[PDB]
Amino acid sequence: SNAQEQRMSHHYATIEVSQQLLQLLGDQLVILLRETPDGQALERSQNDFRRVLEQGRANTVDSAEQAALDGVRDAYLQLQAHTPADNDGFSEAFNGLRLRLQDLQQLALAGISEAETSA
Amino acid sequence: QEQRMSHHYATIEVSQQLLQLLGDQLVILLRETPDGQALERSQNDFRRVLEQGRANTVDSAEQAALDGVRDAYLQLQAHTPALLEAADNDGFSEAFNGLRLRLQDLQQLALAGISE
């Protein structure tokens, strides 16, 4: 059933966009938690977030998914409106932890795909 | 089949709960006056969820990954006082909170979909 595979790939696409956006948000928090925030790097990351979000919005079919991504867009706009306390050691430790958590989630998810291969 | 996938889902749920608690800690730390008692509660909740997760995770690769999470979390904790000892928009903290919850909820809506 390549149909089933088609369905799975959809949810995995939404999961993938959300994962990318959360990774970029983390990147931005990491930058902001450093004692001398790299302004150009922040700008690049914000650009990347908007690109990934818009490409995600273009790649959905359910207008409720589009609705949720529009909500993400509005929320990201608010985050920007408020975008201006810090510590390099914390920033690094946070980065390590959040990467490990993200990676663990993606390892388990891959784990499920291979168990939807043996269906 | 049904066992394997069930185990991997449990791990995704543990990772989601930990990421949520980590966000909660950041939300607290990003406020102008971080609430130390609230922070400690959240730290304790992370340790509890993590230890339960390590205790009950079946997949060997995921078990090892959680041991890495534990080490990394000890490091975050060790560096938290330094952060606290160092202006921090309540507005930024609130915006961050709303954005991250939306992203996490969408992710989990899609995770559930895969499951159901």
Contact assignment for A112 to B114 by CB distance below 8 Å: yes
Is CATH 3.30.465.10 what the domain over A1-119 is classified as, yes or no?
no
Q: Give the tokens for residue A77.
A: 């706009």
Per the entry, the structure determination technique was X-ray
Contact assignment for B61 to A93 by CB distance below 8 Å: no
Q: Give the tokens for residue B5.
A: 């996938």
> Is residue B66 a contact partner of residue A104, using CB atoms and an 8 Å limit?
yes
Of chain B residues 80-109, which have a CB less than 8 A from chain A?
A: 80, 82-83, 86-89, 91-92, 94-96, 98-100, 102-107, 109
Instruction: Spell out which residues of chain B touch residue A15, defining contact as CB-CB under 8 Å.
Output: 107, 110-111, 114
Instruction: Spell out which residues of chain B touch residue A78, defining contact as CB-CB under 8 Å.
Output: 95, 98-99
Contacts of B25-32 with C-beta under 8 Å, sequence gap 24+, read: B25/B80, B26/A29, B26/A94, B26/B96, B27/B93, B27/B96, B27/B97, B28/B93, B29/B80, B29/B83, B29/B84, B29/B88, B30/B88, B30/B89, B30/B92, B30/B93, B30/B96, B31/B88, B31/B90, B31/B93, B32/B87, B32/B88, B32/B89, B32/B90
Q: Tokens 């409106």 sit at which residue?
A: A81
Tell me which H or E stretch contains B81: helix B60-85
Domains of chain B, by residue range, sit at 1-116
> Is residue B105 a contact partner of residue A97, using CB atoms and an 8 Å limit?
no
Closest Cα partner for A17 from A96, A72, A99, A80? Answer: A72
Distance of alpha carbon B93 from alpha carbon B78, whole angstroms: 22
Residue A20 CB-half CA count within 13 A: 18
Is CATH 3.40.309.10 what the domain over B1-116 is classified as, yes or no?
no
CA A81 to chain centre: 20
